[PDB]
């Protein structure tokens, strides 16, 4: 439970844990899909793919190292996992790929083979992963003509028109030192890693800063991807949520826990202490749903996603769900809040403390890049337990009550009513 | 064309410097319509109800 | 318009306030119209004719 972070020439962040069996090392840059353009959209995802290319991956496999990368909206990460003893050989492969081979990975035979793979990759996503496809379009319409609208995997049209030069241009503008953080998770000590880093000098493009842009903004709107050939309807609906480092960061996440997630086929899920379940189970309004409180640097999204085969009652699904959310402003109970606290801790714990260091790296990296530090799991619980019904009400009355929404859906959505009908349900009539 | 590239709505969208601009106008209109309707309904109801009160020709002072 | 946000603050006007304002309107509006009407017809009214009579 130690969050150590020091700065020499580069900012080093680590979180050591005795028993772990393995150690993960990697660099996390403060720029992701939110930094791209509509035309070079997908460059970051492309970088990730060559970094994991058969060539670069085989070089690490001989050495007994495993590679992992993750492209997000606000950040980007390249991670190498190793045994606690080879904590130095991971750094050799890291530097060898970001300075030495930052020209060998970009060969005309490797690039074309990779491009052909991310194309079949992004295509497969759009053709079959409907729930994530819908969630991606939700960001697209909610944050249209703004940084958060760009999809992480990039679009097919911007991808196929991408060249080696675009990779370089992005790398020379974002893979900078002032826009990076070296992260180490597993079991290795902070002093053990910082020494191996401060050993090898050479700045390489120091003092250089990444380009600036315009602030992200939420726009109440919708995108309907109707497709009657699909056997279900997948929808996602949300309001402007909370950005990371917001006073209500936790109040929002708790609010989403109150309604939680559901799976009609799992006996135990049908028994949860969620009032909404009394309404949706009678006629089986859906196969599943899940609420979320997505947070990013400039903004976020609070809402839910759902999947259903009850195509003639989608209006009841949306109506009952929105009536429940109305409650947060006027009648949420003490016990609902308390149930949420307990469940929020359990989920927040299971995330922050998993038996996998690669997840730890992403969580640590993403946090330190935005606030310059990481809030300890024990510190979070103190904030969570401090939330009162009055807090949730004040939050809901500002973020949910009579506020614009963003909608996205695909499949048999003929039954999903017009925007104004959904929007009207964001409140209730009163004397 | 990619579905992720939202068409242009610039001609319709208001340059958001005053977030609750359209809301305040809509709610004032809706509120004023509700006001004048209620007064109209009240006047209509009273007109019909008063037609049943003693007629001008039957108020003879004996 | 910030004039709206001072009284109702981003929320719509509620029925009670609408009904209350309607009763007020009815009285005010009627006097305003009757006044204008009688003034516009000054000289023609019975009130005016009675003033010119003495019996
Ligand atoms: C059934 C539906 C009918 C709809 C007809 C529509 C065609 C338009 C002509 C309407 C004529 C009646 C009203 C009238 O003459 O009052 C006139 C005002 O009329 C209006 O404002 C009409 C607009 C209302 C439209 C409907 C609103 C919603 C419908 C409600 C249904 C429920 C004068 O009103 P008043 O204050 O003198 O009062 C009256 C007046 O002074 C009386 O003489 C007095 O006795 C009483 O006490 C007083 O309150
Ligand atoms: C015959 C002549 C009759 C003349 C009388 C005119 C009626 C007066 C119109 C005033 C409208 C007042 C109003 O605001 O009504 C609202 C209800 C709400 O309908 P809603 O679907 O639940 O709301 C969506 C819109 N909100 C309320 C969120 C803003 O919307 C309604 O129920 C309005 C329907 C009225 C039908 C009459
Ligand atoms: C037919 C005879 C005519 C009778 C009179 C006509 C009807 C007049 C109704 C007047 C007010 O009715 C009023 O409507 C507004 C919406 O417009 C409601 O407001 C509700 O929706 C609005 C809009 O999303 C929200 O901002 C608000 O917080 C919510 O309470 C209010 O609670 C209700 O009280």
Curated annotation (Swiss-Prot), chain A:
Subcellular compartments: Mitochondrion inner membrane
GO biological process: aerobic respiration; cellular respiration; mitochondrial electron transport, ubiquinol to cytochrome c; protein processing involved in protein targeting to mitochondrion; proton transmembrane transport
GO molecular function: metal ion binding; metalloendopeptidase activity
Membrane topology: Peripheral membrane protein
A matching Pfam family: Peptidase_M16
The entry's keywords: Electron transport, Membrane, Mitochondrion, Mitochondrion inner membrane, Respiratory chain, Transit peptide, Transport
GO cellular component: mitochondrial inner membrane; mitochondrion; respiratory chain complex III
PANTHER family per record: CYTOCHROME B-C1 COMPLEX SUBUNIT 1, MITOCHONDRIAL (PTHR11851:SF126), METALLOPROTEASE (PTHR11851)
Purpose of the protein: Component of the ubiquinol-cytochrome c oxidoreductase, a multisubunit transmembrane complex that is part of the mitochondrial electron transport chain which drives oxidative phosphorylation.
Miscellaneous remark of the record: Present with 19300 molecules/cell in log phase SD medium.
Name by which UniProt lists this protein: Cytochrome b-c1 complex subunit 1, mitochondrial
Native organism: Saccharomyces cerevisiae (strain ATCC 204508 / S288c) (Baker's yeast)
UniProtKB/Swiss-Prot annotation, chain B:
Subcellular location: Mitochondrion inner membrane
Region described as Hinge: spans on this chain: 60-62
GO biological process: aerobic respiration; cellular respiration; mitochondrial electron transport, ubiquinol to cytochrome c
Topology Mitochondrial matrix: residue spans: 1-20
Annotated TM spans: 21-50
More info: The Rieske protein is a high potential 2Fe-2S protein.
Subunit structure: Component of the ubiquinol-cytochrome c oxidoreductase (cytochrome b-c1 complex, complex III, CIII), a multisubunit enzyme composed of 10 subunits. The complex is composed of 3 respiratory subunits cytochrome b (COB), cytochrome c1 (CYT1) and Rieske protein (RIP1), 2 core protein subunits COR1 and QCR2, and 5 low-molecular weight protein subunits QCR6, QCR7, QCR8, QCR9 and QCR10.
Name this polypeptide is given: Cytochrome b-c1 complex subunit Rieske, mitochondrial
Species: Saccharomyces cerevisiae (strain ATCC 204508 / S288c)
Phylogenetic placement of the source organism: Eukaryota, Fungi, Dikarya, Ascomycota, Saccharomycotina
Gene that this polypeptide is encoded by: RIP1
Included stretch of the parent chain: 31 to 92 of 215
Swiss-Prot record, chain C:
Gene Ontology cellular-component terms listed: mitochondrial inner membrane; mitochondrion; respiratory chain complex III
UniProt KW keywords: Electron transport, Membrane, Mitochondrion, Mitochondrion inner membrane, Respiratory chain, Transmembrane, Transmembrane helix, Transport
Subcellular location: Mitochondrion inner membrane
All ranges on the Mitochondrial matrix side of the membrane: 1-14
Transmembrane spans: 15-40
Keyword Membrane assigned: yes
Claim: Transmembrane helix is one of the keywords in the record: yes
GO biological process assignments: aerobic respiration; cellular respiration; mitochondrial electron transport, ubiquinol to cytochrome c; mitochondrial respiratory chain complex III assembly; proton transmembrane transport
Quaternary data: Component of the ubiquinol-cytochrome c oxidoreductase (cytochrome b-c1 complex, complex III, CIII), a multisubunit enzyme composed of 10 subunits. The complex is composed of 3 respiratory subunits cytochrome b (COB), cytochrome c1 (CYT1) and Rieske protein (RIP1), 2 core protein subunits COR1 and QCR2, and 5 low-molecular weight protein subunits QCR6, QCR7, QCR8, QCR9 and QCR10.
Family, similarity comment: Belongs to the UQCR10/QCR9 family.
Function: Component of the ubiquinol-cytochrome c oxidoreductase, a multisubunit transmembrane complex that is part of the mitochondrial electron transport chain which drives oxidative phosphorylation.
Additional note from the record: Present with 4550 molecules/cell in log phase SD medium.
Protein name: Cytochrome b-c1 complex subunit 9, mitochondrial
């Amino acid at each position: 439970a130690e969050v150590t972070q020091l700065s020499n020439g580069i900012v080093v962040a680590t979180e050591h844990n005795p028993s772990a069996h393995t150690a993960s090392v990697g660099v996390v840059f403060g720029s992701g899909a939110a930094n791209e353009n509509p035309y070079n959209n997908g460059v970051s995802n492309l970088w990730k793919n060559i970094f994991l290319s058969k060539e670069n991956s085989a070089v690490a496999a001989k050495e007994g190292l495993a590679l992992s990368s993750n492209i997000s909206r606000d950040f980007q990460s390249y991670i190498v996992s190793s045994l606690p003893g080879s904590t130095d050989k991971s750094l050799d492969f890291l530097n060898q790929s970001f300075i030495q081979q930052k020209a060998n990975l970009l060969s005309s035979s490797n690039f074309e083979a990779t491009k052909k793979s991310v194309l079949k990759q992004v295509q497969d996503f759009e053709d079959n992963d409907h729930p994530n496809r819908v969630l991606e379009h939700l960001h697209s319409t909610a944050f249209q003509n703004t940084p958060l609208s760009l999809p992480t995997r990039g679009t097919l049209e911007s991808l196929e028109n991408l060249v080696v030069a675009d990779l370089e241009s992005f790398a020379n503008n974002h893979f900078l030192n002032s826009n990076a953080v070296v992260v180490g998770t597993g079991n290795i000590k902070h002093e053990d890693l910082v020494n191996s880093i401060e050993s090898k000098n050479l700045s390489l493009q120091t003092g250089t800063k990444p380009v600036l842009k315009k602030k992200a903004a939420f726009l109440g709107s919708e995108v309907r991807l109707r497709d009657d050939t699909l056997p279900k309807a997948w929808i996602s609906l949300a309001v402007e949520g909370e950005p990371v480092n917001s006073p209500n960061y936790f109040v929002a996440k708790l609010a989403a826990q109150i309604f939680g997630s559901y799976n009609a086929f799992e006996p135990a899920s049908r028994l949860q202490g969620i009032k909404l379940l009394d309404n949706i189970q009678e006629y089986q309004l859906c196969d599943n749903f899940n609420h979320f409180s997505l947070s990013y640097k400039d903004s976020g999204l609070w809402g839910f996603s759902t999947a259903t085969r009850n195509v003639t009652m989608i209006d009841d699904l949306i109506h009952f769900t929105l009536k429940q959310w109305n409650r947060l402003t006027i009648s949420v109970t003490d016990t609902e809040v308390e149930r949420a606290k307990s469940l929020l801790k359990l989920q927040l714990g299971q995330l922050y403390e998993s038996g996998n260091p690669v997840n730890d790296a992403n969580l640590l990296g993403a946090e330190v890049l935005i606030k310059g530090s990481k809030l300890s799991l024990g510190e979070a619980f103190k904030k969570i337990d401090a939330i009162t019904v009055k807090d949730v009400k004040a939050w809901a009355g500002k973020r949910l009550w009579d506020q614009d929404i963003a909608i996205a859906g695909t499949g048999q959505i003929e039954g999903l009513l017009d925007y104004m009908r959904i929007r009207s349900d964001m409140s209730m009539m009163r004397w | 064309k990619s579905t992720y590239r939202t068409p242009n709505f610039d001609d319709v969208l208001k340059e958001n410097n005053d977030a609750d601009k359209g809301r305040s106008y809509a709610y004032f209109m809706v509120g004023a319509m509700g006001l004048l309707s209620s007064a109209g309904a009240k006047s209509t109801v009273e007109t019909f109800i008063s037609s049943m009160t003693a007629t001008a020709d039957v108020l003879a002072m004996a | 318009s910030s004039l709206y946000k001072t009284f109702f603050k981003r929320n719509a006007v509620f029925v009670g306030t609408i009904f209350a304002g309607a009763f007020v309107f009815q009285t005010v509006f009627d006097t305003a119209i009757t006044s204008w009407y009688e003034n516009h017809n000054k000289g023609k009214l019975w009130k005016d004719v009675k003033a010119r009579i003495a019996a």
